[PDB]
Structure formats: structure tokens, C-alpha cells
A and B are shown apart, each in its own frame.
Chain A
């Protein structure tokens, strides 16, 4: 019906056009008869009849009189629903300013009138005068005059100047001005001006003027003369007990406005004095402001409840506004809610629904079936029968729920799997029965959790539930591709107990014909479940053709394993069950079953596994007792030894040999060692406590202790918890993070005294408080991510782009967190991968890397692979399947129409709770040590050989890589400047050897040539001081910076020169400039004048001197500037220091051949890594510190900033052991990089300084190039998630997120038109979203619009 939504400010004529009448009285209800009053807020003549097809007077009360207006009372005879649409208007006696265009920064009135907002407020609220027309006098036009100044001007000139006071003056000023003349004058002033602040103000005003001119808006329309009113049905008077009626804030505000307007009218008609009418006008303006926005200016008007009333703006914005409370989310019918219990008999696709819930939810279906089958003749009869709960009603209910899926959803819907479709099964009781295997997907436990159920109605919804949202379809996590259906607590324990062996059990050593005989023997009691026997196993394997071929053989196994083999499908081998089946073993067996056979056999196998595990866990009867937590007999001895050691340390400290800090460190180390020894002894005792007499000989076997069985099987518990149960609790930390000297040496089996419990309460409370406070931050971050990535869907198959990002394994000096296989798994390559050293292709250009391709890549020792990335997708208004990659939920490539952005946002947001928010809390090693054996490679290094033959680094950014024999870069290290090298490039090294040593305390100055040292331009007492040492007494020279040096020493630059025997400088090898080394401030020199030095000798020494998980993730995704950002070189060239001003250092970068327009003002306390005359490239660190993402994008490109962001986010998430694919982070990064600022206008019409969408620039450039014209140059800009979300083409999405007032004001001023492209806009409107099954339908619309 409609294709787009247009928003603009309303003219008084159009406002009058909307209204069906004029409201002139504040009366609402007679309160004697409930008929509405005439000409009031509730009026039948203006808005509509109260009753359907009835007249207020009562002359006409039938459909036959439809559309004819009565003459006695003037009430049209239509449906009463017209009261929801018809509006009215109020004719203000005096003009009133609109608050949304008044106090919403930037102030539109102030910006357009170019005069301060406080002057606007003063003249508007009737406190001063402003001149509409200055005239031929000294008074300027836009001059603000107070009362006595106005009187002086009036007595000076009676009528030469015309000054008014109030909103009428503002309206006259807005109307008198000319938009085109002002715009051209502003443009010609901006062309000649040069001030940056003036340029910004002028361009902002130019943008506002152009927006006003292009649209049909008029400035005078920003001052209200006619006030629209809401339809009565949208502000109803809710009836209450008796004659009381519910109060509505909007009604009170409208009544106050009407009363003020009537009083002003009666004062104007009576020719009241100026003071009274001015006060009335001011109070009317305040009332209108309160109606539009209560708390925007001044104190909000309070009602009878001693609280501010809800204005029009208050009920549209915010979390409780119409956008977020009734449009994006809403209450639905055919829904219920109940607690959840566990149903062990249910299948993976089934759920248990109570009879009453199903009867209530499926009522219309029961009515229809009863009417069809003839048990009832009318709807009333069916209602009575279902109320009486007849026998046939139950049969009908069973019939209607045979294959009708129901959507089960938990209250926190963190990710996609929070709502799933299940087949209902009628059950008694009052609690919903949920399948255990899906609980991990729901993050639901049976401790009192509740779930909601929804009933799809149409055939399409049922088919989507069956095919898309069914439980069986959801088997892999979309976040990382890991399986989501794994046994957790009892299945694992049962399978572990069943698949175990005892060295001497009942019926051991016998031979069985097959698994059936084993089951018969176990059930008959003639054999034990752990008896080691030999059974005849027939296993089927898949050949090359896929046919199943059987192999029958005698296998040495246990009775339990043979019994479990019965439920294993035919295609699987016997090696999976011939072992103790823990959680990992069961997960691996399920993965193999899924990989070999398919989906349905995997589901059946999982159900059978759950049933068998539950049954045999029940049969085992495993229980936990006080005797199961065995305390080692050596714990007392270890504790006594530790106490003796700490007593000796305390005695040494009292003697004075060791100070407090090192004594505390040694005590902590001793207690940690004691705890480790106790834990090791307890684990050794527990793991093999059981000893069995086999043939009269004692034999050691794995213990059958229930606690140890639970720990080993992986059901519940871990090493730390078992250690706390049976060993000492270890050291504990104070709330500030400091470790307490005395640890908790008491087991949980034993008694913890009061002090130990009080100590542990600190950590317990800290953890609980962090968990409680994490939820709000996680939810806010998830909402921001969902918004910023709501409109991204797959709309194409292949861009054809040859660009992409290069993926390599991540290593930081000792560890390989993520090998290449996981990084490049399921991603389409961007270029042919050449075989290393042969220049032969290994994989084609556009092949998706599945498991076989990854195996081929890893077997050929490939380190770097360039793959297509979402951030490099050439598709506009969406991405492509090839550039995105394989879908993580389904192994195949992703399909068109999938909402990748929402999935990515949910996948990132969901593990937010697992992170940490509260901040937590030796010196850095001075040398680099190699942990493996391989070659050494040096990257970005300009080194020199010293006198001893060692190599010293003269480059700031130097990479030292340890490479294995296969060419894989196993280790990476960052070598600092002025670092000596034990071994050079290309030389093999042994494990544990040290290859680089350096001093981090101070930075030295290294000479690249050898010769005598000559001094240049230092004088004692001006630039250098020769200070004697405290003990040696040698006079070393210290250079003072600009703070200490005098004016005479300002231009004196200290320098050291390397000279030969002649006495002149030695020319630098490869550089015409001679060897000069300038000494910066606070530089200490030890060598004396004329001392011969070799290459690499240190001329002088310069002395040299976080956030948790969720805050760091939020800062990274918001592109927040760090407190002390690293200073980077904008352009490549030589460095030079200029004159110092403002307590700052001047930096000049001189390119080899280019111009020199770039200068920098480094803060004084910021350390300078670069020297006086070194060469630096683009994106080179001048001052150490955190790197601002904007600087990285500006100086290194999109790929570099994307890599930095994904690396930081992945590091933060991996610190907590969370696996998230990089596709989601890349999608978020691409969504952040959506705007670009022009540089050269070119043939395009874009303004030079304008910032516009990147897709629009790309389309315009493509169109211009297609015609042979020239394009436009652009620079991409980085925006935060909220900033990018607000700055989007669709104003509906921006207004529904946050800052609704500002977004709506800007859209109204600019006259923006929003086309309904995206998920949020279509959800708000109510049509099908352009994603998923509806996506194709939307394409049809795109086909119809073109035709």
C-alpha cells in the first residue's frame, strides 16, 4: 500500500487541515450524564460519536442513517473507532515556540538566527526586548535590549526602531530573513575565511540553510500558532469504582493550555495593561512547553501525585516509550507461561504440555474441529462443551496437537537457541516437561526456572517452526559451530560406570556369542557389568561406494561395553565404545556418528544414549558420602613443614636479613608449594586407592570412589573443587586483590573456623557482586551491537572481488593461541594459494575451505592464507555469500537472505556474562629467550656489528621470528631499539637459549660508524652540567632540557660527532649528511671528549619509565579514544625538532621529495621514541602507548584496523575461554565503517567537506566512471556502534534506539524520507522482514517497483 515514510515539520494550514474542529473549553465529562461536553477535550461533534452508528442526541440510532450529520447536535453517525483517528486544533492567542526546535542541541532557532540560545530563551520567556528592524539608527537588527535599555532607545527615537518582545518577535525575525541570500553570503564568507572554529560554525549554518532550502520547510513554521490535539481514544478516561475516573497527564496538560489560552484571549479583548498580558503570554508559553516536553526546561509541572506529568515527548521516547514498549516488542495472544520440569522419556523433538494449558491455547482449533465433526452447532455450544470438559473434547485436543509445533522460550533470550519449536505431548500435572539435552541450549536448570509457550497459527508459521526452529535442526552453535547437544550430568556418569572394567569381577574371562548374551547374563545376575570378557562383535563399515560391509571378530572388552554396543548404529566402528566413556568420549562418538551417517541416525543415537545413561545411572546407585572425601595422611606432615618454613622465614625477618616484601613473597611461594604438594598427594591417593585381589595377588586399578568417578567422568566437579573438598583450600585474596599471608588449611570435609570463613566471604561476595552487576552492561552492549548490525543481510552470491584479509596463526612470544586451521576453516579464499617454494597452485581461487582443504593446507606447511572477508565485500546494501563464508550452523555455504548481522550481534553478546567487569590488581624480562629449536629471522631491522662482533639493532620496530624446520613461524618477539644480538639472522638456535639482551631501564644512543667523539655546541651552565658521581667521583655530563636552559641556550643544540684523525665528521655510509647525534633532555654521557669509540658503542643514556573484559570490549566496539594515545607519524620522512612553545616539543616531518606542510606539538611529558634525525614511515610509533583505532584506520588502512580490533576482542574473549568466530567481529567492524568524508568533489555533486555513506560514494563513482568522467576522492571514517547506529539513512531505526528527540528533530528539519529497508523498520511497520523466507517476497516488490 505504501512504500516510504516522509517526515517534516507541519505548517499551521496543514495542522488546521488535520483537525476536524476547534477545542475551546477544558470540560471533559459532565459527571452527571456520561455524555461528553460540547467544545471540550472530549466532544462528539469534533472527534466522533461515543457509540457505534449512533447519535449523541439520539435522533438516529441505525445503520440506515450512516454518513449523515445530525442537525440537533451536529454529531456524525459513523463507527466509534473514528474517535481514534480524528484530531482537533487549538487557536493560540499568541505565537508559541516549539521546544523540540528550541532546547535540543544544537538549537535550530539559535543556529538559524546566528544568535545565542540564552538570548533566545530570554526574549522568548518575556524578560527582554529584541529589535525586528533596527532602522537607520546605531542599534543593530539582531540586538538584545533589556527593559531600561529599551526605554532609553524609545526615548531616543520614538518610532525609528521597531523592537518587540516574545515569540512574536522571534517569528518576525525568522520570517523576515531570506534563506538564499543568507546562504550565499555565508558561502562567500567561508570561502575567504581561514579560522577553524569559524569554518566549522559557517559550514554548520550552511548545512542547515541548505537543508531548509532543499525541503519545503519554512523557518516561521518552527513557531507554533495552531496547536494540534490527540484523539480522545488515545488519551481515554478509564472508568473506576463508583463515579471516580482515572487521571491522565495529557488531559491535565491540555486543560492547562486551554485555560491559559482562554485567559489570554479574555485579557487581550479587555485591553489589559502590558504587564498582565506579558505575564499571561509567558505562562501560556510555559504551559505549551510543559505539554510538549515537561522536564526539558526548568522544573517539570507536577500533578496531584506530587510528580511531573507525562508529556507527549515523555510517552514516545525512552525504554517505556511507544517505540520500545509497543512497537519493537509487544504482548501476544495464544501464549502461556509455566515452570519447567524434566521429562526423561521425551524425544529430542518433543516437549510435555499440561492438559489445561493446551486446552486453553488451542481453543479456536477445538471449536473448529467440534463444529466440523458435528458435536456442536454454534460457537456458544462449543464454548459450553469445552468449559464442561467433555470426553470428546480431549479426543479433539489430541487430534489438533498431533503435528502442531509450539515455541518454547526462556525469559533471557541471549542468542538464537533461546526459543525452539517442539512437538507437544499431553501430560498431567501443572509443569512443562522439557527435554534434558536441550537444557544446555536454554541455559535452564530445574531450580524454579520458568518458560513461555507460543502457538503458531498459520500454515507458514507452523512450517517455519518445523523446518527452521525445530530442536532437531539446531545441533551446532551458530556462534562457533560447536555442537550444542551433549550429555551433561547423569548420562555421562551412567555411560562411564557401564563402560568400565574391574580386574576381578563376576563372570570374568568367559566367552560370549554377542551383545545379547552379555545383556542376558547381566540381567540374570550371572555376570558383572565390569567383567573383562571376550565377545563376538560384528561391525559394519562404509566402503568407497558407501555400501555397508560387515566384519565379525572376537574382541576383548567388558560386559557393559558389549551391552552399550547394541544401541550404536551399524556404520560406526567398535573402537568408540571399547574404552571408559567420559564426557569427551561421548561427544567424540556423537561427532563421529554425525559425520559418518547423517542427522536422523545421530538424533536416534543421542536419544538412545540418554536413555541408556539414565537407566544405568539409576541401576548403579552411585552416592556421595562423608567417607568418599579421603584426606591424605601426609597432609599434616606437609602442613607442619610449611609452618616450620614460614616460622624460619619470620625469624630471619626479625633478625633483619630479609625485608618485608621479599619475606612476604617467599611466604606466599612456600604456601603455594605446600598447597600443590597436598593436592598432588590427595590426587595420587584418590585416583588409585582401590586394590583388588586377583589370584591372591594385590593389584592396583582405577578407583571406584564416587567423588573420583564424578570428577574423572566429567559429569560434575573439577580438579579445583575436588581439591577444595579433600585438600586445603589454598590462599585467598582480599577484596582489593592482595593475597592474604595465612591460607585456609582446612578441608570442606573438616571444619573451617570463623576466621577462614570470614576470609573466604570476601572472594565470595566479590564474585557475587560482579555477577549481579554484569547483566546491565552485557544487555546494553548486546542491544547496541544488535542495532548497529540489524540491517545487514546476505543479498548476493558473489561480488567477484579479488580483495581480502591475510590470516596467520596468532603468537605472542611463547604460545600459539589459534593455529591457521581454525582461522581459515569454512572461509572462501581470495587468491590461489601457491605451494611453498614451488610456485604451484594448491587450492583454486574461489573454493570454500572445508576440513579436507584445511588438512591439505596444514600438511603442506602453509602459514599465511588470504581469504575473502565481510569487511571487503563489494556488495552494497548487504553482503555476499562468498565474501561471508560458510554458515556455522549448517556446514554448507550460507544462503541468500540470512540475517548475518543479528546472528553476529547475538553471538558476540551472549558470552558477555562469562566475562568480567571489575578490574583486577614482577618486572619485564630484559632478554629474549627461545623456547624451541629452529632458525631465526629478522624483520624490519637495520643493525650494525659492534667491536666484539655482536649485532646491535638500530631500528625501532624490529621483529625476531623463530621458525621451525617446515617454515612455520613458531615464535614472534619484538626486539627493542639498541638491543644486542647473541646470534645473527639465519643462524640455528637451541631450546632455552637467549638470543637478544637489552637494558629496558634506559635508552642508549648507538653509533653506526667508528671514530673519535667530538663535542658540538654545549656550554657548562647553559646546556650541560658536569656532575660528579656520589661514590666514584667521575664527572659525567647531563644535558638539561628547555625547562632549565636559558634563552641563550635555547638555540644551542648539543651534538656529538664521529670524526677521523683529520678532525672532520665522517660521512654516513649511504647518506651525504655527516654523522651527528643530538642529545635530548635528561641525557647522561659518560665518555669524555676525544675518546675513541667503535661502532655500536653507547654515546649517551636517556632514562625511561588494565581494564577488564566487558569494559575493554565496550571501548573497542565504541572506538573510544585512549587516555594517552600513541603518537604516530602522519607522513613518511625525516624527523626534526623545532622551537619549543607552550611547554611542548615541535616536530617537523620532511619528505625526501615532497613538501613540508605537517608540524606537530607533542606534549612535554610524552616520551619521544624517535631521535633527532631518524627516518620514520607512515603509522610509526613516535610516543609509546595505546593506539587509537581512528589513527590506525587513517594511517594504515581498513585491513589494519580490522585486524587490530578482531585481535583485541578475540584476546579478551579467549582470556575467559570463549570461542567466537571472527566473522561476527568482522561484520561488526564493517558496520562501523559505513561513512566516508569527501576530499575532492570531482564530477560528483558531493560537498567537499560532507560526510556521506560509503555505498553512495561507491555507486556515484561507478556511475561517473561508466560515462568516462572523473570520480570523487573519499576517506573512510571510523564510528562507534552507537554513533554509527544514530548516523544512518533510516531515521526510524535511529529514533527507535536512543536520543529519539534529537533524531526526530533533525529528521523533521531536514525533511528526510525513509524507505523501509531493514529489519527494524519492517518490524515496526508490521510487514515481512527482508530476510529469511520473507526475503524472496521482498525481492518481488523490488521487481514490481522497477516494472
Chain B
């Protein structure tokens, strides 16, 4: 469960883009069918995203890097399939 987001706020440092990052992570979990980086204690998607943000496993840079890696591997796979 979650009662406060102060530690997540200080991890992000602005409290405005933290909402955006958490929303992106929650959309990745709920729609993209990803997997949490933290144990799933029957929490909601937003709470799980905030919890895994708290310990620094997810931020804007990390999400961008993972998205870039997934795009590059999908491009490599489709190029190999075409060839």
C-alpha cells in the first residue's frame, strides 16, 4: 500500500514530472504487458509504479534507455526477418 509519495518526490525532485513518469510506467504495465521490477503485493498499477520509482529503479532516463533498446532490438529482428 501507499500513504505518502514524499520519498518518490525527492527521488524525482519536481513532483510534476514525477506524475508523468509514473503515468508512463503504469501505462507500460497495464497496456504494454510489461512486468514490475518490484514484488507484486496485489497493489494497483499506479502504486506499483510509484513504489518501484521510490528505490530509483525507474526514472525518465531509464525509461528512455529501455524504450530505445526495445526499438533497436525490434528493428534488428524485423530486418533479419526481411532478409
Q: Determine if B44 and A1333 form an interchain contact, defined as CB atoms under 8 angstroms apart.
A: no
Q: Determine if B46 and A603 form an interchain contact, defined as CB atoms under 8 angstroms apart.
A: no
Q: Determine if B26 and A1336 form an interchain contact, defined as CB atoms under 8 angstroms apart.
A: no
Q: Does A375 contact B (CB under 8 A)?
A: no
Partner of B47, one of A403, A473, A896: A403
User: In the complex, what residues of B have CB within 8 A of residue A603's CB?
Assistant: 3-4
Q: Which residues, 18 to 39 on B, are CB-close (under 8 Å) to A? A: 18-20, 22-23, 26-27, 30
Taken together as a complex, chains A and B put the C-alpha atoms of A459 and B50 apart, in Å, by 12
Q: Determine if B4 and A460 form an interchain contact, defined as CB atoms under 8 angstroms apart.
A: no
Q: Does B17 contact A (CB under 8 A)?
A: yes
Interface string of A1321-1347 (1 = CB under 8 A from B): 000000000001101100000000000
User: In the complex, what residues of A have CB within 8 A of residue B43's CB?
Assistant: 402-403
List 14 A-B pairs, Cβ < 8 Å. A403-B46, A459-B23, A460-B19, A463-B23, A467-B9, A468-B19, A473-B5, A600-B3, A603-B4, A896-B14, A896-B16, A1333-B20, A1336-B16, A1336-B20
User: In the complex, what residues of A have CB within 8 A of residue B14's CB?
Assistant: 895-896
Q: Does B66 contact A (CB under 8 A)?
A: no
Taken together as a complex, chains A and B put the C-alpha atoms of A1222 and B5 apart, in Å, by 30
Taken together as a complex, chains A and B put the C-alpha atoms of A603 and B3 apart, in Å, by 9
- Closest A residue to B17 by beta carbon equals A1336
Taking the closest CB of chain A, its distance from the CB of B1, in whole angstroms, is 7
Contacts A459-B27, A463-B22 aside, 11 further interface pairs with beta carbons under 8 A come to: A347-B3, A403-B44, A460-B19, A463-B26, A463-B46, A466-B5, A467-B8, A467-B19, A468-B19, A473-B4, A1336-B17
- Closest A residue to B43 by beta carbon equals A403
Q: Determine if A466 and B50 form an interchain contact, defined as CB atoms under 8 angstroms apart.
A: yes
User: In the complex, what residues of A have CB within 8 A of residue B1's CB?
Assistant: 403
Q: Determine if A459 and B3 form an interchain contact, defined as CB atoms under 8 angstroms apart.
A: no
Q: Does B15 contact A (CB under 8 A)?
A: yes
Q: Does A472 contact B (CB under 8 A)?
A: yes
Q: Determine if B20 and A598 form an interchain contact, defined as CB atoms under 8 angstroms apart.
A: no
- Closest B residue to A895 by beta carbon equals B14
> Which interface residue of B3, B9, B15 has the most chain A CB atoms within 10 A?
B3
Q: Does A897 contact B (CB under 8 A)?
A: yes
- Closest B residue to A898 by beta carbon equals B16
Q: Which residues, 392 to 444 on A, are CB-close (under 8 Å) to B? A: 402-404
- Closest B residue to A472 by beta carbon equals B4
Q: Does A464 contact B (CB under 8 A)?
A: yes
Taking the closest CB of chain B, its distance from the CB of A484, in whole angstroms, is 16
Q: Determine if A467 and B15 form an interchain contact, defined as CB atoms under 8 angstroms apart.
A: yes
Partner of A467, one of B5, B27, B30, B44: B5
Interface string of A882-908 (1 = CB under 8 A from B): 000000001000011100000000000
Q: Does A1202 contact B (CB under 8 A)?
A: no
Q: Determine if B18 and A467 form an interchain contact, defined as CB atoms under 8 angstroms apart.
A: yes
Q: Does B71 contact A (CB under 8 A)?
A: no
Interface string of A625-665 (1 = CB under 8 A from B): 00000000000000000000000000000000000000000
Taken together as a complex, chains A and B put the C-alpha atoms of A463 and B15 apart, in Å, by 11
Q: Does B6 contact A (CB under 8 A)?
A: yes
Q: Does B59 contact A (CB under 8 A)?
A: no
The size bracket of the interface on B is: 20 to 34
Q: Does A462 contact B (CB under 8 A)?
A: yes
> Which interface residue of A462, A463, A473, A1336 has the most chain B CB atoms within 10 A?
A463
Interface residue count on the A side (C-beta < 8 Å)? 28
Partner of B19, one of A349, A464, A598, A896: A464
Taken together as a complex, chains A and B put the C-alpha atoms of A890 and B4 apart, in Å, by 14
Taking the closest CB of chain B, its distance from the CB of A890, in whole angstroms, is 8
Q: Which residues, 38 to 55 on B, are CB-close (under 8 Å) to A? A: 42-47, 50
User: In the complex, what residues of B have CB within 8 A of residue A895's CB?
Assistant: 14-16
Taken together as a complex, chains A and B put the C-alpha atoms of A466 and B50 apart, in Å, by 10
Partner of B46, one of A466, A897, A1333: A466
Q: Determine if A459 and B2 form an interchain contact, defined as CB atoms under 8 angstroms apart.
A: no
Partner of B30, one of A459, A468, A470: A459
User: In the complex, what residues of A have CB within 8 A of residue B6's CB?
Assistant: 598-600
Q: Determine if B44 and A599 form an interchain contact, defined as CB atoms under 8 angstroms apart.
A: no
Taking the closest CB of chain B, its distance from the CB of A881, in whole angstroms, is 11
Interface string of A592-634 (1 = CB under 8 A from B): 0000001110010000000000000000000000000000000
Interface residues of B (CB under 8 A from A): 1-6, 8-9, 14-20, 22-23, 26-27, 30, 42-47, 50
Q: Determine if B15 and A459 form an interchain contact, defined as CB atoms under 8 angstroms apart.
A: no
Taken together as a complex, chains A and B put the C-alpha atoms of A890 and B10 apart, in Å, by 12
Q: Determine if A468 and B4 form an interchain contact, defined as CB atoms under 8 angstroms apart.
A: no
Taken together as a complex, chains A and B put the C-alpha atoms of A603 and B26 apart, in Å, by 27
Taken together as a complex, chains A and B put the C-alpha atoms of A470 and B1 apart, in Å, by 14
Q: Determine if B26 and A459 form an interchain contact, defined as CB atoms under 8 angstroms apart.
A: yes
Q: Determine if A404 and B5 form an interchain contact, defined as CB atoms under 8 angstroms apart.
A: no
Q: Determine if A472 and B16 form an interchain contact, defined as CB atoms under 8 angstroms apart.
A: no
Task: Contacts A459-B30, A467-B18, A1332-B16 given; indicate if A349 touches B23 (C-beta within 8 A).
Answer: no
Interface string of A446-485 (1 = CB under 8 A from B): 0000000000000110111011101011000000000000
User: In the complex, what residues of B have CB within 8 A of residue A466's CB?
Assistant: 2, 5, 46-47, 50
- Closest A residue to B9 by beta carbon equals A467
Taken together as a complex, chains A and B put the C-alpha atoms of A1029 and B26 apart, in Å, by 97
User: In the complex, what residues of A have CB within 8 A of residue B27's CB?
Assistant: 459
Taking the closest CB of chain A, its distance from the CB of B16, in whole angstroms, is 5
Taken together as a complex, chains A and B put the C-alpha atoms of A626 and B9 apart, in Å, by 55
Taking the closest CB of chain A, its distance from the CB of B73, in whole angstroms, is 26
Q: Determine if B4 and A1335 form an interchain contact, defined as CB atoms under 8 angstroms apart.
A: no
Q: Determine if A404 and B16 form an interchain contact, defined as CB atoms under 8 angstroms apart.
A: no
Taken together as a complex, chains A and B put the C-alpha atoms of A349 and B26 apart, in Å, by 22
Q: Which residues, 182 to 221 on A, are CB-close (under 8 Å) to B? A: none
Taking the closest CB of chain B, its distance from the CB of A401, in whole angstroms, is 10
User: In the complex, what residues of B have CB within 8 A of residue A404's CB?
Assistant: 44
Taking the closest CB of chain B, its distance from the CB of A483, in whole angstroms, is 16
User: In the complex, what residues of B have CB within 8 A of residue A473's CB?
Assistant: 4-5
Q: Determine if A468 and B15 form an interchain contact, defined as CB atoms under 8 angstroms apart.
A: yes
Taken together as a complex, chains A and B put the C-alpha atoms of A1225 and B18 apart, in Å, by 31
Q: Determine if A462 and B16 form an interchain contact, defined as CB atoms under 8 angstroms apart.
A: no
User: In the complex, what residues of B have CB within 8 A of residue A890's CB?
Assistant: 15
Taking the closest CB of chain B, its distance from the CB of A465, in whole angstroms, is 9
- Closest A residue to B5 by beta carbon equals A467
Taking the closest CB of chain A, its distance from the CB of B65, in whole angstroms, is 20
Partner of A1333, one of B2, B16, B42: B16
User: In the complex, what residues of B have CB within 8 A of residue A347's CB?
Assistant: 3
Taken together as a complex, chains A and B put the C-alpha atoms of A603 and B5 apart, in Å, by 13
Taken together as a complex, chains A and B put the C-alpha atoms of A463 and B23 apart, in Å, by 7
Taken together as a complex, chains A and B put the C-alpha atoms of A742 and B42 apart, in Å, by 73
Taking the closest CB of chain A, its distance from the CB of B64, in whole angstroms, is 15
Taken together as a complex, chains A and B put the C-alpha atoms of A404 and B42 apart, in Å, by 13
User: In the complex, what residues of A have CB within 8 A of residue B19's CB?
Assistant: 460, 463-464, 467-468, 1333
Taken together as a complex, chains A and B put the C-alpha atoms of A459 and B20 apart, in Å, by 10
User: In the complex, what residues of B have CB within 8 A of residue A1335's CB?
Assistant: 16
Q: Which residues, 61 to 81 on A, are CB-close (under 8 Å) to B? A: none
Q: Determine if B5 and A459 form an interchain contact, defined as CB atoms under 8 angstroms apart.
A: no
Taken together as a complex, chains A and B put the C-alpha atoms of A1333 and B46 apart, in Å, by 16
User: In the complex, what residues of A have CB within 8 A of residue B45's CB?
Assistant: 459
- Closest B residue to A464 by beta carbon equals B19
Partner of A402, one of B16, B20, B23, B44: B44
Taken together as a complex, chains A and B put the C-alpha atoms of A1332 and B14 apart, in Å, by 10
Taking the closest CB of chain A, its distance from the CB of B81, in whole angstroms, is 33
Task: Contacts A466-B46, A467-B18, A1333-B17 given; indicate if A460 touches B5 (C-beta within 8 A).
Answer: no
Taken together as a complex, chains A and B put the C-alpha atoms of A462 and B17 apart, in Å, by 14
Taken together as a complex, chains A and B put the C-alpha atoms of A473 and B2 apart, in Å, by 12
> Which interface residue of B2, B16, B42, B43 has the most chain A CB atoms within 10 A?
B16
- Going nearest first, the 4 A-B pairs with the smallest beta carbon separation are A403-B44, A460-B23, A459-B26, A467-B5
Taking the closest CB of chain B, its distance from the CB of A602, in whole angstroms, is 10
- Closest B residue to A462 by beta carbon equals B46
User: In the complex, what residues of B have CB within 8 A of residue A459's CB?
Assistant: 23, 26-27, 30, 45-46
Taken together as a complex, chains A and B put the C-alpha atoms of A462 and B23 apart, in Å, by 9
Q: Determine if A897 and B16 form an interchain contact, defined as CB atoms under 8 angstroms apart.
A: yes
Taking the closest CB of chain A, its distance from the CB of B6, in whole angstroms, is 5
> Which interface residue of A347, A349, A460 has the most chain B CB atoms within 10 A?
A460
